[PDB]
Design a protein around this nucleic acid. Structure first.
Ligand SMILES: [Zn+2]
Lengths: 129, 81, 139, 213, 81, 98, 132, 24, 210
RNA sequence: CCGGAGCGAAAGCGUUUGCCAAGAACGUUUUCAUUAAUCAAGAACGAAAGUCGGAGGUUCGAAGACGAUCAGAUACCGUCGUAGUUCCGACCGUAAACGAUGCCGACCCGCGAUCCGGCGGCGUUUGACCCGCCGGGCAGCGUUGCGGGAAACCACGAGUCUCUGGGCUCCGGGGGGAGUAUGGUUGCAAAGCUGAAACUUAAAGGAAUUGACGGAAGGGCACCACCAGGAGUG
RNA sequence: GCAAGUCUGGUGCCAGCAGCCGCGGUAAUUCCAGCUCCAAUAGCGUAUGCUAACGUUGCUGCAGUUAAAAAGCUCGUAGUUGGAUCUC
């Protein structure tokens, strides 16, 4: 009935950010979600999120700083190489100055600029700007 | 209600909301050691007993089956905690 | 909603394959119909013999006798109605002669106040009708 | 010019330096003389369309002409105004008044490398009016304004030299087409970018800085 | 916003709502910039100092302007906790 | 266009209700769509209650009332002036007229 | 058809705010003031104006009219608005405070006050109106 | 009334079946 | 005011309990829940007087932050506080709309009454909805004596108090006028104010003669 | 009694009592432990009319007769009445079968009611009523001017849509021709499902607004309206 | 539309013009001609196929309350997509 946990996670963050909230509760947690938030937090789009360590799927309470415009997922997780990565940048990011595309390379979850520096592609999860 | 702190909620809001919509799920029911004048031993019984509960020796009835928690008879103790 | 699944390339391809048929401009160009019923049979021009000189009346709210000619094609023997474009060029039309007819603006559609004429004559007696209108190629 | 509002009195006595000081505090510019006080030198208008609308009455059809005038200084400022008056000349002059009162700052960004003055929009912005929505995509320095003649006049008067436009909807409606483009232009200075994440230091409002005057 | 050489190219740096970090547009007429005056610690008179807060029109329209200024005042210790 | 949110009836959460008959035209009208009108009037008119009062062989006898439950269709409830056509914003007033 | 028009209504009001001591409660004296003060090319119009001023003067001496106001009567109400009892209605000898309102005071620093009468709460919760 | 265009159409189709049935 | 000098005193608590400023009626707004202490048995929502005093100090800080007293405006279209805003304006030097608020005084510039203040103080947000909504087309912060069931659509400084009772609303105007003058230097905060709080109380025509 | 209340997948369902086996919601520190969601092909059910085979046919009433009206009524109105309407079995699978709005899931406003269950609280009454709260259910109001829309309007979202990607099924591509032709297929039949083309056409249509009009409603006005009469005409 | 003449004369719902909307029923800026003017240009019109326009075939990227539209409703395989949990 879910079919995705990262979709409902970024959908809760995107709505709470537009409604002016300061913190958002994410009902399901996963290592892909946590590493996704780290890419946004490392670039200065969210605050210090706290993972509610329950003996279940787990919850996450993210501290919203209002610096985010929108966070979304790209379902399905298409296989993005390095030669076609420039195409996804023009279809998902507002401009070449800011905004990042979260890819899942073989070295782990990272953004599109880190994947280009490491010279490796992978599956795309979503984007944020 | 925009900057409502979610990671440190008040103990009243946690007790009021649903048993599943909390930060960490917790049962709302409890166990109690009914002490009838017949049996002198402590016999734990679920709140929603759902069945005719009897102590050791079968002296008297403890709980009549109801929709929610058990309807205790006259002369019953509490959780004793 | 649309199926976005990673293994839905067949479902997406077959769906768009069957939904393109609901397009009028696609179904007329990808079926036997609209090609065999077309008198030209997919050609831009066609030669024919002038059978009659009929003047069709324009539609409301206009009132003018559109000068056309009932022409029978040579390539397949079909009889069509080619419209004499210019003024007074119906007198330049000879009886039982070869005329090179072509389409009339919109493809397979009547143009203007003419009820059903969708063809126009370009050349008459192996020479252009435009020259006959401008005092050239006296024939 | 006798100012009727306290904002017009300050700009009349040279209290406010630049027009951007009014935008900083979002003060309603109710006097058109404030606009021609700062940007009156280089400010070229353009009548986009005179659309005669009619009011069916017992005497028949009462014709009343609408005027769509676009006003911009061709660098950083653009305004759009409408006016429905009986006379054509009155509607044009009335729209010029409302086009100045509705003037707004437009932010200009860079495409890739930042060398020289900004030429294009900072990011992809979308404005909506009725059904028609337009999107302004940043473009290289030598691409020009790629749009219809209607939104091109707004992008040129806004100082945007290069832009990629993706206009959908009933773009034939010139009224909603220009207002949708003008609404996308207005969102350039309301879009939060990493170059604006700096904590804003507040100053004194012109109503507070010159309260005794 | 610089130009890779230390030159700020924006003609004006807009304000951000101190309650929701939203940029206050040039035509956000429902927005306000309220000044909360500072008082002396021993006497309590206005000493020319004040804490400036800006609220965008959207947050103010929904009714979250009083709760925001109340929380923003506790951040600067203007009001009691 | 949809003129009323409830479509002119009180069917919420149901698919079909029992149709009843009107009074002045005998039309099959749904139970929730019927124009209810509980008429309670005296058996004798106020202009003739005094003639019956003095002719009563008792001292104090309260005249009973005519408790009639009427049902009207939309086409007849308006012709009989039971209900009127209200303004666009006045139709939302579900309060009974005083 | 004794209703005046806006020409008589407006003129009769602007002549009072500029000239209040001039006009009294006599129509004939007020009729002569309008000849020297105002310029009217009609005589029947002057009698309508001065006639309505006489009607306004009876209302002015009776109280403040809803259109304008005078400075002689406003000072009477202003002093009447400055009225203050010898003892204020707030500082009473004993204040009745409910039990729930008392606990709120106990939470603050002013939990032990002299002039507080702890009123017993009324048993039963019938504070809502019957529906239907 | 679009329902009587459907009434006349079912009435015309029913006649076309009787004409086609006698040509067996 | 978090300081010990601005803390409410015993004289202030007795006036609040006497005027009835701790009664918010049977209804409650979802944005006014933070200012309600506890609901009593008769459905009345008890307003926290400490929260009332803090918002009262907070509103006074905004009034004294306006240099020109004329740039502050007080409006009361309801008769319960018509004279309360007149004595308030005379005590502080502000403008006032004591009668009926004409729609357009804030937006229509060619209009005669075009007073464009810098800070609006509203008696009742529900009764004075027109000055509030009109103060949105122009950047004017608005303070309001908000009840527990009062809409806060454009109220940035909500003072939780009972704006329904005549003695209750009259005290809030006296308390605010006192604290504004205390933060300016008019009152030394040692001796009580010479102005009695009953000067702001509305008098119905049945008792005006007495 | 009967309600903008409940139940069911829908169509649909309200006299008493009895029998029969289901169902949601809630209760649960029970149990099972991902066993799912949506679903071509396939199937159950499916108002009413109709069809075949019996019973019964009060009332109503297709058809039909007759009475009225009209220039003409093969109708509305009236009398009467077949089939039908009622029941029993097998078919038919069509409705404005509509919330004209697929199912599942997350997120996203407020308030007062209402329905079932659970929970804890002054009281009144031998469960009833009172004040709340948690979970779904039918709905309502307010704000949508935190959004959406062409707008009407939309929190049973019609919101989170150029800042476009939660999953899946079905389905639309200007208006006609036309749900027609043909083929296949179902059926006793009527017809159901599937479903074209030639040809024709510059509009058709949606929402909203101002006028006009109504044999719609409401209010008001004048001896060129009447009341009360008075003159005179015919 | 779409850059360029209420220019000149007669032709008067006729002849015609017009891809579309539309121009003629005795002062036609449209037609029947001159002058002049206009993107032009050794090329330029016309007919037809096809591409963009077309986010009117929508994977990117459309729609299905009222404009064309969610099967009356539910079951159901293939297909499609599937809760969290294993050296950071
Ligand atoms: Zn009826």
């Amino acid at each position: 009935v879910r079919m995705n946990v990262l979709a409902d996670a970024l959908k809760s963050i995107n709505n709470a950010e537009k409604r002016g909230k300061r913190q958002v509760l994410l009902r399901p947690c996963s290592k892909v979600i946590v590493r996704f938030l780290t890419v946004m937090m490392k670039h200065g789009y969210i605050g210090e999120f706290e993972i509610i360590d329950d003996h279940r799927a787990g919850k996450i309470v993210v501290n919203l700083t209002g610096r985010l415009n929108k966070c979304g997922v790209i379902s399905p997780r298409f296989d993005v190489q390095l030669k076609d990565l420039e195409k996804w940048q023009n279809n998902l990011l507002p401009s070449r100055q800011f905004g990042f595309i979260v890819l899942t390379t073989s070295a782990g979850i990272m953004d599109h600029e880190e994947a280009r520096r490491k010279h490796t592609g992978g599956k795309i999860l979503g984007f944020f700007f | 209600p925009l900057a409502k702190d979610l990671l440190h909620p008040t103990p009243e809001e946690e007790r009021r909301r649903h048993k599943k919509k909390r930060l960490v799920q917790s049962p709302n029911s409890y166990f109690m050691d009914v002490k009838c004048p017949g049996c002198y031993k402590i016999t734990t019984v679920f709140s929603h007993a759902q069945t005719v509960v009897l102590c050791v020796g079968c002296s008297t009835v403890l709980c009549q089956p109801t929709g929610g928690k058990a309807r205790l008879t006259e002369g019953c103790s509490f959780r004793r905690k | 909603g649309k199926c976005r699944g990673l293994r839905t390339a067949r479902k997406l391809r077959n769906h768009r394959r069957e939904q393109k048929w609901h397009d009028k401009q696609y179904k007329k160009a990808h079926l036997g119909t609209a090609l065999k019923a077309n008198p030209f049979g997919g050609a831009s021009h066609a030669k024919g013999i002038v059978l009659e000189k009929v003047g069709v009346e324009a539609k409301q709210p206009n009132s003018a006798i559109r000068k056309c000619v009932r022409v029978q094609l040579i390539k397949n023997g079909k009889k069509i109605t080619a419209f004499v474009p210019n003024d007074g060029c119906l007198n330049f039309i000879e009886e039982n002669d070869e005329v090179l007819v072509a389409g009339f603006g919109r493809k397979g559609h009547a143009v203007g106040d003419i009820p059903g004429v969708r063809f126009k004559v370009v050349k008459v007696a192996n020479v252009s009708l435009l020259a006959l209108y401008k005092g050239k190629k006296e024939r | 010019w006798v100012p009727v509002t306290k904002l017009g009195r300050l700009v009349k006595d040279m209290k406010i330096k630049s027009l951007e000081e009014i935008y900083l505090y979002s003060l309603p510019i109710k006097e058109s003389e404030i606009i021609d006080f700062f940007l009156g030198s280089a400010l070229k208008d353009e009548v986009l369309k005179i659309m005669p609308v009619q009011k069916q009455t017992r005497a028949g059809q009462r014709t009343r002409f609408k005027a769509f005038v676009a006003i911009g200084d061709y660098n950083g400022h653009v305004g759009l105004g409408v006016k429905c008056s009986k006379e054509v000349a009155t509607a044009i002059r009335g729209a010029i008044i409302l086009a100045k009162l509705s003037i707004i700052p437009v932010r200009r960004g860079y495409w890739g490398n930042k060398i020289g003055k900004p030429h294009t929009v900072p990011c992809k912005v979308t404005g909506r009016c009725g059904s028609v929505l337009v999107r302004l995509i940043p473009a290289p320095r030598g691409t020009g304004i790629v749009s219809a003649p209607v939104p091109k006049k707004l992008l040129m008067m806004a100082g945007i030299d290069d832009c990629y436009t993706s206009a959908r909807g009933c773009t034939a409606t010139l009224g909603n087409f220009a207002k949708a483009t003008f609404d996308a232009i207005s969102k350039t200075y309301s879009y939060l970018t990493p170059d604006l994440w700096k904590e804003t230091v507040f100053t004194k409002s012109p109503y507070q800085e010159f309260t005794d005057h | 916003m610089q130009n890779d050489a230390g030159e700020f190219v924006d003609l004006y740096v807009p304000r951000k709502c101190s309650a929701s970090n939203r940029i206050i547009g040039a035509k956000d007429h429902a927005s306000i910039q309220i000044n909360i005056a500072e008082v002396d610690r021993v006497t309590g008179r206005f000493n020319g100092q004040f804490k400036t807060y800006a609220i965008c029109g959207a947050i103010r329209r929904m009714g979250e302007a009083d709760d925001s200024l109340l929380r923003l005042a506790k951040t600067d210790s203007i009001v009691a906790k | 266009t949809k003129k009323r949110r409830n479509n002119g009836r009180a069917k919420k959460g149901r698919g079909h209700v029992q149709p009843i008959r009107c009074t002045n035209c005998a039309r099959c009208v749904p139970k929730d769509k019927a124009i209810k009108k509980f008429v309670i009037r005296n058996i004798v008119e106020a202009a003739a209650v005094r003639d019956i009062s003095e002719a009563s062989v008792f001292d104090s006898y309260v005249l009973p009332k005519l408790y009639v439950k009427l049902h009207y269709c939309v086409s007849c409830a308006i012709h009989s002036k039971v209900v009127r056509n209200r303004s666009r914003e006045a139709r939302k007033d579900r309060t009974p007229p005083p | 058809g004794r209703v005046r028009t806006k020409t008589v209504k407006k003129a009769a009001r602007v002549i009072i705010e500029k000239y209040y001591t001039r006009l009294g409660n006599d129509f004939h004296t007020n009729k002569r003031v309008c000849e020297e003060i105002a310029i009217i090319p009609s005589k029947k119009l002057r009698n309508k104006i001065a006639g309505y001023v006489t009607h306004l003067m009876k209302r002015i001496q009776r109280g403040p009219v809803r259109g304008i106001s005078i400075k002689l009567q406003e000072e009477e109400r202003e002093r009447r608005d400055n009225y203050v009892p010898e003892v204020s209605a707030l500082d009473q000898e004993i204040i009745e405070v409910d039990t729930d309102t008392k606990e709120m005071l106990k939470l603050l620093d002013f939990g032990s006050l002299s002039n507080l009468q702890v009123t017993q709460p009324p048993v039963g919760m019938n504070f809502k109106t019957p529906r239907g | 009334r679009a329902k009587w265009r459907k009434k006349r159409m079912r009435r015309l189709k029913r006649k076309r079946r009787k004409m086609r049935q006698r040509s067996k | 005011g978090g300081l010990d000098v601005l803390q409410m005193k015993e004289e202030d608590v007795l006036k609040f309990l006497a005027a009835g400023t701790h009664l918010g009626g049977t209804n409650l707004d979802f944005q006014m829940e933070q200012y309600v202490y506890k609901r009593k048995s008769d459905g009345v929502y008890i307003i926290n007087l400490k929260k009332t005093w803090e918002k009262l100090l907070l509103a006074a800080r905004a009034i004294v932050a306006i240099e020109n007293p004329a740039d502050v405006c007080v409006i009361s279209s309801r008769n319960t506080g018509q004279r309360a805003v007149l004595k308030f304006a005379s005590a502080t030097g502000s403008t006032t709309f004591a009668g009926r608020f004409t729609p357009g005084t804030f937006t229509n510039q060619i209009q005669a009454a075009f007073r464009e203040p810098r800070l609006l103080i509203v008696t009742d947000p529900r009764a004075d909805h027109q000055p509030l909504t009109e103060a949105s087309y122009v950047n004017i912060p608005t303070i309001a004596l908000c009840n527990t069931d009062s809409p806060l659509r454009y109220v940035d400084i909500a003072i939780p108090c009972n704006n329904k009772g005549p003695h209750s609303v009259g005290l809030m105007w006296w308390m605010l006028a006192r604290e504004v003058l205390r933060m300016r230097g008019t009152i030394s905060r040692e001796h009580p104010w010479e102005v009695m709080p009953d000067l702001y109380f509305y008098r119905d025509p049945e008792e005006i003669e007495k």
